[PDB]
Every structure is written in structure tokens, then in C-alpha cells.
Amino acid sequence: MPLVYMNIIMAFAIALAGLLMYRSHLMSSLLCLEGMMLSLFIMSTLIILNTHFTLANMMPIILLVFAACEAALGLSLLVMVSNTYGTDYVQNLNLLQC
Amino acid sequence: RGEYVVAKLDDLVNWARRSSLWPMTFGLACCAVEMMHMAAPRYDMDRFGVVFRASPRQSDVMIVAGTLTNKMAPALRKVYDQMPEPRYVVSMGSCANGGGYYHYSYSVVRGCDRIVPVDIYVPGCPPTAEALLYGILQLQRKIKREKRLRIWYRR
Amino acid sequence: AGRIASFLKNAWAKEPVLVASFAIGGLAIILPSLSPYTNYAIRINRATPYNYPVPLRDDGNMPDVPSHPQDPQGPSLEWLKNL
Amino acid sequence: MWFEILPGIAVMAACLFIPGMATAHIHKFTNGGKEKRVAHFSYQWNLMERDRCISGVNRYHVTKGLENID
Amino acid sequence: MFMINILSLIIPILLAVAFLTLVERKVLGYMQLRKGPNVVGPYGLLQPIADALKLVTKEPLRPGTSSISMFIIAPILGLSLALTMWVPLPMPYPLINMNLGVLFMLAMSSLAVYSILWSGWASNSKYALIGALRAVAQTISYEVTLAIILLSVLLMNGSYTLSTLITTQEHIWMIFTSWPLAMMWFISTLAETNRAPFDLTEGESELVSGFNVEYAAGPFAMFFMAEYANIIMMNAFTAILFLGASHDPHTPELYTINFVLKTLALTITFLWIRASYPRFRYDQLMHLLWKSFLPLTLALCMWHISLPIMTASIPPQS
Amino acid sequence: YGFSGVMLRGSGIQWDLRKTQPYDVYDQVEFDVPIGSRGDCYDRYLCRVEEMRQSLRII
Amino acid sequence: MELVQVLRRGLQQVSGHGGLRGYLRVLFRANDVRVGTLVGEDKYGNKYYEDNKQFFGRHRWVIYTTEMNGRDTFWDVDGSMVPPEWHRWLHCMTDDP
Amino acid sequence: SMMKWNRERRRLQIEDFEARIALMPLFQAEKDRRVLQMLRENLEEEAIIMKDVPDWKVGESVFHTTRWVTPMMGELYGLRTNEEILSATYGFIWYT
Amino acid sequence: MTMYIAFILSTIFVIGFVGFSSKPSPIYGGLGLIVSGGVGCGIVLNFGGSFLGLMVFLIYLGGMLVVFGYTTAMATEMYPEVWVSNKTVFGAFVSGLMMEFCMVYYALKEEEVEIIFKFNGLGDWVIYDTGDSGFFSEEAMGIAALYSYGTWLVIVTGWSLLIGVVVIMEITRGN
Amino acid sequence: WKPPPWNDVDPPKDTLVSNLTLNFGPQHPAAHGVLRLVMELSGEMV
Amino acid sequence: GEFGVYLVSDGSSRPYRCKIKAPGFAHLAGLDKMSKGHMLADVVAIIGTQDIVFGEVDR
Amino acid sequence: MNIMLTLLTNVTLASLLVLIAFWLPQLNAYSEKTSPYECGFDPMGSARLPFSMKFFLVAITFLLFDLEIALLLPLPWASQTNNLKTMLTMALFLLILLAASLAYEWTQKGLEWAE
Amino acid sequence: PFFDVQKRLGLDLDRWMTIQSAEQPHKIPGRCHAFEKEWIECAHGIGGIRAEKECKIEFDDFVECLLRQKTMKRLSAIKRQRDKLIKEGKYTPPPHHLG
Ligand SMILES: COC1=C(OC)C(=O)C(C/C=C(\C)CC/C=C(\C)CC/C=C(\C)CC/C=C(\C)CC/C=C(/C)CC/C=C(/C)CC/C=C(\C)CC/C=C(\C)CC/C=C(\C)CCC=C(C)C)=C(C)C1=O
Ligand code: SF4
């Protein structure tokens, strides 16, 4: 079970850890999400190029296709939190707690 | 010899500075209009290597053209501070030179020299664009006579 | 005519870029079905050999398959040479 | 009266000339006069590698024809 | 001697960029009844060297509110990419014969905006941030049409390799086949290079100097390097794409001369339009494209998608 | 707003001191005042160009 | 036809200025190569030419002297090197040299 | 004009592809001989290299089946020199 | 040396990942993702794929430019942070960098690490396959079959993109 | 933990606007160099 | 525009009060009314359509 | 071999030019010289506070538009298939859906900038 | 599939990409086409619970061909032992193995 796969999997692991931990902002978490997407693309591309699964090379393209759509929707959510909140931080997003 | 080498380096650097004097768009009063007419086709600053450029960060010579008043003097001094060295100040017109018509007013600086060190004094009210071109050429010769690396060699 | 012609003329007056884009799009949509060369294009894409024509075992019967590339029986693309 | 403009392009033309020739000449010099063989697909690269192998001197541009075979 | 080729694709390009300033200040000045630079030596042939010397000996102040690291990495990014995007051009024989040269150049052109981005943000100025955002909007709007027009034009090429364009335009210029797109393409080359009448990132009239406002001496000269190298490379790419030229395999010098002349003519038209128009107003140059360029280029994309099929003229991929 | 000159002439207001209250010998020369239409920048620019032409006539 | 004559008079440009050496002398000093009738010369050495065919503004001109009053003026020159008597004629304030 | 030129280019590409087809069997024969020879060389080297090893019966297959497997490029050039592996693996991808 | 290439590029990929996963200012996180994406495109290039790497390049530069344009607009602060300014971001950067350091340390000596999956790290040149692509790049024919084979994928992707524009419209409507 | 509003809408918060205010003034080529235009603007719309 | 002077004498050889009515003053007073919703570039156009001169404005 | 050698040449040449630009000219720096430039007078104080961008909708839909060109770009190789009818229908499907997206944005304010 | 509408309508939507042995464009074979074909033809209709016990060595060969380290571990230990014993002079490579 070869080496480059280890580096891409480990990069995805740190990006998953980074997403699941917030510090201040909303953009940073979204960036960490798209980094997870990047690691997924690189991994899948490596897998299918190595296996000569020619009909499956469209799969990373569709990955990126829905990647950009989710990034867009998340940053529109950030637009609205900024419009109703002035800023984008998450610790002040607490109105739903009670 | 080292003196000859530093001499030639002085000539090269001084030639570059004098042949690409980039002035600033700091017209203040009627003295700016002549400042435009020498930029007009007849006299055409461009052929002498001088091309107008705002944003003091990328300019060398300031032609203070027009009356320098009290309300503007802090802005002029600050803007002169933004200029990275080497920098030169050309004073156009009697108002920017020593006060001009309104030398005895209450809100006029009695000479631009009181705020920045003026390098070339161009007289006129307003100076003819030929006279301002002559002042710029005089500043050019001034840069030509600089002895920076010579003084460094004789530190 | 009437309302339709007036609308076309007003659209040509006001927004000619939209009129041109819609006309080009409609043309590019509906012409390719009508044009007879489309099939030709497909055949050309079928004519271009990328993989080897792997030979098949001659167990006798099949007459159509050539026994040599120069042999006359088999598919030919003289049409492409002429066209 | 724009002929004074013309030198500016002229030398500049020379500037834009210098790479286009040089690369070509370099491609001729480093590949034995002939054009640099371009491998846009694996088949061309296989041909180039077999040329390097057959040449015996490990340069693909060195070509052998009828004299090499018996 | 691959190093020799690399140096021969850099120093001549930098010299051409230097003389681009002189030919601009002369052609423009002659548009405006002036004479342009005339004093330094014969016909101003030393002005590029003179101001080159000044800009690298003038004091390169660093603002107190800057971000040092990006303030420095931005000029390097700009010049490095402007120089790198010259390597896949099929000047007789391309230096780097890439199978996806068009996509590569699109990628590096899209990267070049990041130099403007980081330089504007790191400078800590109102004008610089304004110019950075105008650059954001301009380059995204024009990049969409850049990609679509490139696809539409190259549909007749058969692939993305730059060299085959010469084979494509063997008997006729490609502009006779896609003259509408070419017009749009030219405008895009005007805007991606951030030139007139779309030079709103600098906006000398309204933004003093835009994203170069806090850039002085060497870094400023370097951003100018990137801008003018991009101008010449874009005109070269336009010449390669549409105005093809004859290429004798035995004498590539003929194709070199023809290509260089076409690039020179396209650049001269760049300075021509720079001195014959007012300047666009931000949203207009956006509303120009998202409402007039984008629909037309989509329609032309469908037209050029269908065109080889309806006429049985699909170009080969090899 | 106290506007005068072009900014009146550029917004339909038919007023010009050279004609309404002639001074010097302006009651002798013949010229036309370029009344504006919309009051925008373009209309005022066109008014200024036409004033240039009419002043040429007066010269 | 006019192309040939145009190429030709460019050689009268170098012929009038004392050959090639004087041609580059005036080209590098006065930045012009145009010829004109020698209207006169002053005691300081400045040569004073006129050509009525040129448009108003360049019909008269000076090549400044190489040396004046113990100062090398081969490379650096200025407008104050004009003697007062000739400053009238040079600035088109009179037609009498 | 583009239609006519593209049709001619299609004919030329067909001609070139059929030339490649005519030439492919020799390349296939030479390639299979080269890979078999390389595998033989690696096996002979492994015989000497795996001698004092506890248990490394040489020439052993990994797949339980007996049908031949296209050998991985690592097991075709493992003992070869550095330039050989660099040119074999990153050869076409790096040739620009 | 040029022996590994892919190894070093993967390490730069991970370092770029650490850069933006440490929650710095979103501009700096964008820069980190930029370098990570560039070196990832390099890895994909070195692994016999050209179109995919350049597609990552172009698409991610577009996305990250829009992220910047929003960052300095909406998600900014009077005091932007650096990877060394705050102790929290410094701690995250330190944790990530020393972690990957010790992972690659345990990797490239033993070359038999078990972590999560068995990782026999001899060399990425090994796993390459001896093949012949003829006169067609496999990846090009692969992603070119989307319009011929994957019609269903065409339909679903187009529908998703159109309705994505619709939702980007509805979410940002603001009453 | 006061109960959520009956209309389930939080009251609109206070103003959070931070519109730019730059000196379109001296040394600017458009401002003739002797103007000081202090413009309170939101982004580009003044 | 309508450039005027309110000259107030006193019977001596020097004026007592010379007030200068300046069209530029009134035009610049109305700059804000003009630039409503217009962007910064429109403001650049507007302060130009007045032909604003601050020698006359500042008196 | 060639591409990274190139890239290295450009980056080191640029970094060098930066080095000579930043170490040779003998700078003399003081506080007011590096003060931020605000058309003369001292800035009000900001340069990092939120800067409203009214094309935020336009900016974000650029992301989807540029995303679709990833689907679009395989066309030069997609034309050379044996199923030209399906390829043509799908390519026109992508282009028609992009036209519909652009038209929906145009009609429902969309491309028009906020105020 | 949960609600397999594809078999009901006889319409192909995703089955073309499910496996590596399907009809690829231009008849390009997969890297492990033979192993996948053998494994699939082995456990077809037999049952997804009988497949693990019955078609085991076929799937093992296929997964090896996919990842290849009952072969690459062989190579790694070969190279390790070679570099080990060559260090102190037990073995020298033959000339054809270095040029
Ligand atoms: C109504 O009342 C008003 C007032 O009322 C009082 C006013 O006051 C004012 C205000 C007054 C004014 C604005 C004043 C009036 C101003 C004007 C009219 C403006 C006039 C302007 C002009 C005449 C000039 C216009 C400019 C033009 C046409 C062109 C400019 C273009 C250029 C390119 C300029 C040159 C600049 C640069 C940077 C280029 C030079 C650089 C290089 C060549 C670099 C080369 C380097 C190399 C070769 C390096 C090589 C390296 C190598 C080979 C290797 C390196 C490697 C290594 C390792 C070392 C106004 C407006 C007003 O309205
Ligand atoms: S010196 Fe004369 S012309 Fe110049 S600003 Fe003063 S009054 Fe006006």
C-alpha cells in the first residue's frame, strides 16, 4: 500500500482536524474544507491514473464541480452572517443556544 | 585607480538621475498652467526625459507651482517627506519663491523654502514655460555636478 | 408580423448583442441535425485508426475479412480520399 | 516625422528576433542539425528511446539506416 | 546549452520590455503632436537604460504599516510568472513543447493576479486596497470570457498544443474563421494585461497610482517589468492564435521575422488604443462583459462546437 | 443652488448675461446660446464645445 | 518617386554638416540634423542659422559655442549663452539680425 | 477553407496512424523480448543475492494464478542504475 | 535528488496544508492553500496526468481569488494576524510542522510504517506501470468521454450548477 | 436564558457600518492639488 | 459663469470692500447634491464638469 | 528536467533583482518617510477595516461560471469520438444551461451591482 | 441499489463506470483488467456472502494487482539486502546492471 498515498491521506487528516477546530473566523474553516477537497482530488486522481481506469478520470472533475458549489454556498452563508452580524466570527454566533 | 573608477560611477549615476528626472503633479495655482504648457506639445517635457508622475513614492523633483498657504503647508511638508531620496524641490513663481503678490497676507507662507529645502528658484509671475524649462535644465546640471562617490572615496 | 415583427425590430434597436447571440445559438442548435455532413463526420471519426486492427483466426468460412491488407474485400475509405 | 520612432522598434525587433532564432539553432545544434523530435504521445517517446538504444552511442539523433543492418 | 536557451529567452525579452517604454513614449507622444523622448543619445535609444539605472539606485522605502513578506514576494511573483509564460510560445520551435500550452498559460495568467492582490493588500493603504478589489473584479469578469474564447478558437485546432496552430493556419489566417471572437479576445487581452481603456487597477486620474502607489524604485520597476512583459506576451499569443504566418521547416528565421512583425503590430495597436480613448468606469467594464461579451461568446461557443460536425471538418488531435 | 453660466444653460434655463444684460458692445455681435437638454455631464460638455464655436463666430 | 528624394536628402543632411563626423557632432550636441543658412556668428562662437521654410518657432536656431568665458560648453549648454544683441533675433522679436 | 484543410489533415493523420499500425508488431516483439531479458537478468541477480537469506526461494510468483502479469516497472528496473530508472519512469512526462 | 521528486512535493503539499489549517488570517490561509495546490498539481503532473493538474491549478486559483476578495471585504479585522503573531496560530503551526516532520522521519528510514494503513515506502517510481498509450493520452480520452459516455453525469452536474446559482441568489437575497 | 421571541426573530442589532472616508484631496491629479475632498463612501458608491 | 464684483468705495483713492462673486463657489457648494449614488469615478467626472478652479473659489 | 529548471531561473533572477534593488541604493529612512500616503494629509486611519464590495453576488457566481469551464474544456478531445450526436447534445446542454443561469441572474437583479 | 430503477427501465446511468473491466473508450484496457474480469466472472450470481469464502484467491490476486506489495515487499527486502551486503564487499553488481 504505497507511499504518496500516505502523504495525501495524512494531509487530509490534518485538514479534517483543522476543520473540526475553530479559532475566530468563518473563512478559515471554509479554506480548511476546500483543502480537504484538494486532498481528496489529488488522492482520487493518483488512484485512477495509477490503475488506468480511463473511464473514471471524470470523477475528480465532478469532485471539483461540487467542491466549488459547496464553497460558494458556504461563503454566501458567511455573507449573511456578516450582514446580520457585521463580522464573521463564530463565538459571537450564539443566538440559538436557548 | 580607484579615483577614476568612482569618478566614472559618479558620472553614470548622475547621468541617470539627471536624464530621468520624474516630477510630481503638484500644481497649486496659475503657476501650474505654465507647468502644463511646458508639458504641452510646444516644449514637451517628455523629450528631456522628464515625465509627470503622481504618488510621491515614484517622483524625484517637486515643482511647487503656485501660492503655498498656511492650510496647505502641512500637506506639502508631509508629501515632501514621502519622497524617497534623492529628492529635489523646484520653486516656480514669486508666490512659491518668497510670497509673491500675497506676501503680506495672513494665510500665506512667505516662501516655500520655510517648509522644504528648495533646490532651484524659478522666478516669474507666472514664469514663462521656457523659463521653467531653463530652471529644470539648471537642476539637471546641478545633478550633473554631484560628487557622491567621490566624497565617499574621500570619506 | 405585427407584434412579432415589431418585437424583433425593437430588440434589434435596443439590444443587438442579445439578438445576435440568440440567433447564433438557435442556428447552432437546429442546423446540425439538418446538415447531411454530420454523418460524414461520424464516419471520419470511425475511419481514424488508433488501435491495431487485431487479426482474427481464419477458421475458414468468413469471406468478407481480407487475408491481406491489399486484398479488395473489406471496408474501404475511398470516399474520404475523394471528399 | 515618425521615422525617429522607427529605431525603437528596430532594436526591439532584434530583441524579439534573438530567442526565436537561438532556440531553433540550439535545437539544431544539440540534436545534430535535424529538428528536435517532439514526443506528444507515448509512441513517439518509445521511438526516441529505441533510437537511443540502437545508436549505441546513447544519443537519439545519431541515426543508422541500411549500413547498420546486414 | 539549455541554460543558453533559457538565458536567450530572458535577456532579450527584458531588453524588448525596456524598449517598449521608449516606443510607447514616442508613439503616444507623436499621437499627441509631441516628439517623445529625444535627448538621451540618438532618438532616445538610451532612455530605457537611463531610467533602468535610476529605478535600481533610487531609495526603495518600505512603509511602516506594510507586511514586509508579501510586499517583497509580490514583485518576485509578478516578474517570475511574466517571464515564465514566454516559454511555451511556438516561436518557430517552442522552448518547452508542452501538450497543454494553452491551459498552462491560462493558469499562469490567472496566477499573475495574485501579485497585484498581495502587493495591494500588504501595502496598507486605502488606494491600494481599492485598486486590489478593482483588479479582483476585472480579472474574474475577463477571465471567464478568456477561457470560453480560447476554447471556441481552439476547437478548430484539435488540441491545446501551441505548435499545431501553425499547422492549423497553414493556408488561411484563423482570424478569417473567427473574426468576431478575435475582437472580443483582443479586448480581453487589453483587460487582463490591465491596460487601457481598462487600466482601472492603477487609475492614475482617480487612484493616484493604484496598487503601485506605495511601490518605489526597484519593486515598482519590477511590477512594470511584469506588466510590459505581459503586454508583449499577450500580443504574441494573439498573433500566434489568429494571425498565423508561413513556417519553412528549413529556415525558421522567416517565421521568426513574420511572428515578430505581427507581435510588433499588435503591440503598436495596444499603444494606439491607449492614446485614443477615455477610461472605463469600473462597473461598466463589468457590465460590458457580463451583459454583452458573455452572451455573444456563449453563442459563438455553441456555433464553433457545432461547426466542425455540420461540415465534417473535425481537426485531428495528433 | 446659485448656479450660473453653463449649469443654467446646460439644464434648459435660457439665461446668458451676454444677451440678457449686455455689457460693453455685446449687443452688437450675433451669436447663439447653446441651451442644454438633460443637465448631465455630456450635455454640459456639448454646450461648452458649442460655446467655443459661437465665441469663434464672435471673434 | 518622393521616397527616393526623401532617402536622398537624408544624405544632404550628412553632407551639409561637414561630413559624418560633424553629422554626429550636431546630432549628439543639438539633437537635430537639419541644415540651414548661416545667418551669423557672435564673438563667443555660437553659430546662428535660419530657415524660413520651417514652421514658426523653428525657423531660427543656435548651435552653441564649445567654449565661453572659461567654461566647457561642448556638452552642457543653456539659454543664457545668447548675447543680448542676438537674443532679439533668436526669439523672433525682430527680423533684423 | 478550414473545412478543406481539416479534411486533408484528417487524411494525413489516417495515413500516419496506418504507418504506425504497420510498424507496431516489430515494436511489440522487441519490447516483449526486452522485458523478458530484463526479468531474466533480475532473476539471475536475485539467485546470487538471495543465498544466505533464511528462506527466499527465487523466481516465486506472488499471484496464485499462472497467467502472466504485466510486470510493474519497479520489478523491471529495481537493480538498474539511477539514470535507467529516471529515464524509464519519468521519461515521457519530463521530455519537453 | 531527482529520484524522489514526488516525495518532496508531497511534503510541500502537507506544509501548505499546515499553513492554512492553523487558522491564520484568511489571506495567509489562501496563500498556503495556493502553494499546496500548486505543488499538488506538480504531483499530479509527475504521476502521468497533465489535464487534471492544470485544472486544479485554474479552478483553485479562481476560488481562492474569490475567497480573498471576500476576506478583505467581509472577513477582515483592524489587526490581521500572522502565523507568528498569536500564540494559538503559532501553536497550531508548530504542532503540524513537527508532526509531519516526525511522520516522514518514521517513514523514510523504516519504510514499513503501519500507521492506519501499511505503508511500504520504497519509492514512487516502483509502482509505475510499463505501458503503451499509443497516439492518445489515457487521461485525455478519459475526461473526453464525459460527453459521450457519462450523459447522466452531464445532466446531474448541469442541474446542480444551475440550482446552485439559484440558491446563491436566494440565500443572498436578504428580504 | 430569556425565551426566544414570539415572532422567532431577534431584534435588528445596532448599526455596524464602517464606511471608508479617504482624503480625495491634495496632490491628487483629479483634485487640482488644492482641494481636500473628504468623502464618506461605502466601497465605491459615495 | 456669472463672475461678479461687489465693489464698495468710500470717496478715497482705495476701495473699502471688494467682494468677489464666484461661480465656482456656488458650483462647488452643489457638488454633494450632484453626486448622489454616483461612484467615485462619477465624482471625478463631476468635479470636472464644473471646470472647478480654486483660485477663484478661495478668493 | 526543463520546466523546473526554467521556473528556478525566473525566480532566482527576480529575487536577485530585488536584492540589488534593496541593498545597493543606500537608503536613508525616517518615520515620516514611510508614513502611509493619503493624498497629502494624514490618513483617517483604516486600510484594514471592512471594505464593502457590492458585486459579491457577481464575484461568487464567477466561481460557478469558471467552474463550468472545467466541464467545458475537454471538448477538443470530445469532438473526436464515434458518438457525435450525444456529444453535441451534451455540449449544447451545458451551454444552454449556462445561458439559462446567466439569464436568471440578469432578470433577477443578479449581475446588477448593489448600492 | 435501494430502488433499482435502472434494471426496471433497462437504462444505464452509472453501471458503465462501476467496474474497470467495462467498455472503456477506444478499448483501452485497465491495468488490472484480467484479474477484475476473473474475480467478477467467479462470483456472479453465486451470492455476495459466498463470494468471500469461494472466490478468495481471485480477489486476493486482484487486490494485489491493484496495490502490489506481496510483490513490492519482495522488491523492498531485495533492495535492502543488496544495499546491506554490498556495503562491506560481499557482492558487486554485474556490468549490465549499471551500464
Ligand atoms: C483646473 O485646475 C487644475 C489645477 O489648477 C491649479 C492643477 O493644479 C492641476 C494639477 C496639475 C497637474 C496634474 C500638472 C499637469 C500634468 C500633466 C499635463 C501631465 C503630463 C504628462 C506627461 C507629459 C507624461 C505622460 C506619460 C506618458 C505619455 C508615458 C508614460 C509611460 C512610461 C513607460 C514612462 C516611463 C516609466 C518607466 C517605469 C519605464 C522605465 C523602466 C525601464 C526601462 C526598466 C528597464 C530595465 C532593464 C532593461 C533591466 C534589464 C536587466 C537585465 C538585462 C538583467 C537583469 C538581471 C540581473 C541578475 C541583474 C490640475 C490637473 C487642474 O486641473
Ligand atoms: S507667483 Fe504669480 S503666477 Fe505664480 S502663483 Fe503667485 S501670483 Fe500666481
Author numbering:
A (entry chain 1K): 1 to 98
B (entry chain 1B): 25 to 179
C (entry chain 1b): 1 to 83
D (entry chain 1a): 1 to 70
E (entry chain 1H): 1 to 318
F (entry chain 1D): 253 to 311
G (entry chain 1q): 1 to 97
H (entry chain 1Z): 49 to 144
How is this structure described in the published paper?
The entry, exit and interactions of Q10 within this channel are central yet not fully resolved questions in our understanding of the molecular mechanisms of CI. In addition, active-apo and all different Q/QH2-binding states were dominantly in the closed conformation (except state β), implying that the closed form may be sufficient for the catalytic cycle. Taken together, our findings support a model in which Q10 progresses through the Q channel by peristaltic motion.
Here we report in situ structures of porcine respiratory SCs, determined directly through imaging porcine mitochondria by single-particle analysis combined with cryo-electron tomography (cryo-ET). Our in situ structures also capture numerous reactive intermediates within these respiratory supercomplexes, shedding light on the dynamic processes of the ubiquinone/ubiquinol exchange mechanism in complex I and the Q-cycle in complex III.
